[PDB]
C-alpha cells in the first residue's frame, strides 16, 4: 500500500526527535508559571483603579 | 508495529515523575471568584468563535446570523459590522496587526476583510478557496500569512497576497477541529476528531510530533504561554495538557461531576490558570499545575462554544450559543 | 327589580385589601416570569406583560377607592380624576391588548405565511406603544369632566354638554368595550379554531385554549358593567320604563366594580394551573 | 468627548442595522436538505432564484425559502450539524429504487434514524421525500423486494411496497409529540412538490406559533 509505506516514514521522524524527561518539562512549566504569576490579573486580582473592565 | 513500540518505550523511559507529585510542594491557588464585568449584546444567533485583539480592547466574534462584528471591550460598544456571504461561520481570527480579520465556516472558504484601513469602511480583501471541508479553525500567522484548518482532514497555510496555499499539512487522520499558534510564531498544533493531536512545523510542513491519550474527538486546543506545551479539549470530559518536550500527557483535568465535553480551551497570561469552556451551560476554570478546579463560571444560559483570554490577561471573554458575550474580570 | 344595599363597608374594604394582595402577587409573578431569562421575548409575551401592567394599574388605583370607603380623607377632585383615569385607561388597555392578542393569534395561525412575511408583526414594541396611546386617547374623555359632589365624585358636566355628553360617553364606552372588540375577537378565534381543526393541531394548541379561556373569563366578569352602562344609556334616552333603576344603579355600579376587581385579581391566577411552564417557573422561584 | 459620542452613535446605528437585518433573516424560512445518495429533486425547480454548502432561494406563495444542501460536506456529520439548529424543517430525500442497489435503502434508513434521533433536531420537523417513483413502478415489478425485507409479508405491488416503506421510515421517529414527519412522493411536475413543501412549512410555523408564548 502506498499510504502504508508513506506512513512508515512519518513515524520515523516522530520517533527520532529528542525527548527529555517529563519531570524536567513539568519543572520548567512550573518555573515559568511562577515567573509570570505576579503579572497575571486572573491569578492575582488587580485593583479597580488599574482595572479597565 | 515496531515503530509503535519504539515511541511508546521512549515515553515510558522519559517518564520520571508526574506533575501531580511535583505540585505537592507548591501552594494550591484555591477557589477564586468569577464576576461578569460587562456583557456584550446584539447578536441574534449562536456564537461559535471569537478572538481577542493584540490591543487588548477590540475583540471579534462570529455568529450564525451572518455578521462578524468587532466589540470594543473598554467602552462596551461595537465599532464595525461585517456582513457575511455565508451565514454558516464556525471560526474567526483577528490579525495581530489589527488591520485584518478572518472567518471560516461551512462555506469551505476563508474570507479576509479590511478593518477600515482606508476610506473608513470595511470590504472583503481575500477569499481563501481550495479547502474541500468546512473551516473548523483559522489563525493569522502574520499580517500576510494565515494558517487554517478545514474539515477535510488537512490543514493549509495561506498567503493573502498570492491567495494560494504556501504549504499543506495532510498528516492528520481524523477531522481537524481547532488549531493554536505558538507565541514564537514558528509552530502550530491542531487537534482532530481522532484520538491523536499532532504538532506541525510552519517552515518544514511536516508532523514533528504526535500526541495521543484522548478517548474521543478533540474540539479545542491552545498553546501554553511558554510555548513548549499545550492543552487539548475533547468530548470525553477530559482536558489533557501535552508537553512538546515530554511528548506525553503530563497533566489530566477530568472531574466526575462534569461528564460533558469541552468546546473551547484557553490559557491565561501566566498559564497557571487554565479556562475550559464546557457545553453544560458553564465554563469550568482549572489549574494547570494543581490539576484541580480553581473557579466556577456559570454566567451563560446555553452551551459555551468559544472562550478567549486577553493577551495581557486583563479580562476573559466567554461566548455561548445564547447569542451573548460576557467579559469576566 | 327592587334592590337594597346590604354590603358591609368593613367587609368590602377587607375584600378589596385581599384583592389588592392577590392581584399584586400575581402581577409581580407574571412580570418576573416574562422577564426571567435573557432570551428574546415573544410578541405574545410582551402583550401579556402589558396586560399584567394594566392589572397593576387596577391594583394601584383601587387604594383610592379604599380611601373613600374607610379613610374618607384626602378625597379631592384631583385625586378622583387620577383614580378614574387610571381605572378607565387600565380597562381600555386590557380590552385593546386582548383584541391585539386575538389578532396576533389569528395572523400567526391562519395567515401564518403572510404574518411571517410582514415586518410589522415582529415589531411588537411599537404596536404596544400605539395600543397604549389609543387607549389613553379613547379614555381621555372618560375622566376630564369629573368632580366631587356630596362624598361621591361623578357628573359635574357643563350644562350645554350635560344634555348629550353623559349618554354619548356611556354609549361610546359600551361600544368600545363589547361591540367592536367582541366581534373582532369572535371572528379571529373562530378562524383560529377552524384552522386548528382543519390542520389537526388542536391536540397541541394549549396556548390558544388558554388565551380563549382568559378572554371568556374577562368577558363574563366585565359583562355586568357594560349591561348597567347600557341600562344607564337607555335611562338617559328615556327608553327604560322602570323607575327603581334610578335607585338600584348605584348598587349595580358597586357590584360591577367589585366583580371587575375580582377579575383583575384572578386574571394571572389562570396562568398558574393552566400554564405548565409558569407553574414550573414558580417552583424554581420558590426554591430561592 | 466628541470621539466618545461619535463612537456611541456609530455603535447605536450599526446595532439597529444588525437588529433589522436579524429581523429580516427571521422573516425568511430555512430548510435543510439531507440524503444518503439522493439530491437535486427539490433544487431542480424553476422557482429558484439564487464550496461545501449550497444556498438555494425560491419564493412560493409570497414566502421566501432557503435550502442548504450538505452533500459536499464529507466530514463527520455530528461536528457541524449543530450549526443547522433552528431551521423550520428538514427535507430528506430517499430513492424508492434503492433497495436492490447496494443496502442503499438500509443506509438511507440508518441516516434517517441518526438525523431524527440526534437530540439536536427534536423540535424541528422532518420532511420526507420518496423520489424515483416512476422508475420504482417497474422496479417493484422486476424486483420482488422480498430479499430486502425477509419479514416483509406483503403484496408485490407498488402501492403496498410504498406504504411499507413509508411505515418503516415513520417507525424510526420515536418522537411523535415533539416533531411530525411529513412523507411525500415525488411527482413528474415540481408544482406538487413545492406545494407540499409550502404546506409543511405553514404547518410547522403554526406549530411554532402555538408554543411561541413563554407564559402559557
Ligand atoms: C395617565 C397616564 C398618561 C400616565 C401613565 C401611563 C402608563 C401607565 C403607560 C403609558 C404607556 C405605557 C408603555 C408603552 C409601551 C411600553 C413598551 C412595552 O414593551 C413594555 C411596557 C411599556 C413601557 C408601557 C408601560 C406603561 C405605560 C408607560
Ligand atoms: C376599536 C377597537 C376594537 C380597537 C382595538 C385594537 C387597537 C387598539 C390596535 C389593533 C392593531 C393596532 C395597530 C397595529 C399596527 C400598528 C403599527 C405600529 O407601528 C404603530 C401602532 C399600530 C398603528 C397599532 C395601534 C393600535 C391598534 C390599531
Ligand atoms: C362577527 C361574527 C360573525 C363572529 C361569530 C363568532 C362565532 C362564529 C365563534 C366565536 C368563538 C367560536 C367558538 C370558540 C370555541 C369552540 C370550541 C371548539 O372545540 C368547537 C368550536 C367552538 C364552540 C367555536 C365555534 C364558533 C364560535 C362560537
Numbering used by the authors:
A (entry chain E): 9 to 61
B (entry chain D): 12 to 340
C (entry chain R): 23 to 310
D (entry chain C): 6 to 55, 182 to 233, 241 to 354
Q: What sentences appear in the manuscript?
A:
However, the only member of the CX3CR subfamily, CX3CR1, recognizes its sole endogenous ligand CX3CL1 to play essential roles in the cross-talk between monocytes and endothelial cells in the periphery as well as microglia and neurons in the central nervous system. CX3CR1 primarily couples to Gi upon activation, subsequently mediating multiple signaling pathways, causing cell migration, angiogenesis, and apoptosis resistance. CX3CR1 participates in numerous physiological processes and is involved in many important human diseases, such as atherosclerosis, rheumatoid arthritis, neurodegenerative diseases, and cancer, making it an attractive therapeutic target. To reveal the molecular details of ligand recognition and receptor activation for CX3CR1, we solved two cryo-EM structures of CX3CR1-Gi1 complexes in the ligand-free and CX3CL1-bound states, respectively.
